[PDB]
C-alpha cells in the first residue's frame, strides 16, 4: 500500500514546490547558487 503515496506526492507537493523553487532561483538567487 504505497502506490497511492507515489502519485499523491506527485501533486503540488513536488509539482508546485519544484516549480516555485525554479521561480525562486530565477528571482532572488544568483544563477542557481547562493551567490
From Swiss-Prot:
It is found in: Golgi apparatus membrane; Secreted. Autopolysialylated. CMP-N-acetyl-beta-neuraminate binds at residue 35. It comes from the Eukaryota. Highly expressed in fetal brain, lung and kidney and in adult heart, spleen and thymus. Present to a lesser extent in adult brain, placenta, lung, large and small intestine and peripheral blood leukocytes. Catalyzes the transfer of a sialic acid from a CMP-linked sialic acid donor onto a terminal alpha-2,3-, alpha-2,6-, or alpha-2,8-linked sialic acid of an N-linked glycan protein acceptor through alpha-2,8-linkages. Therefore, participates in polysialic acid synthesis on various sialylated N-acetyllactosaminyl oligosaccharides, including NCAM1 N-glycans, FETUB N-glycans and AHSG. It is noteworthy that alpha-2,3-linked sialic acid is apparently a better acceptor than alpha-2,6-linked sialic acid. Belongs to the glycosyltransferase 29 family. This is CMP-N-acetylneuraminate-poly-alpha-2,8-sialyltransferase. The chain holds residues 245 to 279 of 359 of the full protein.
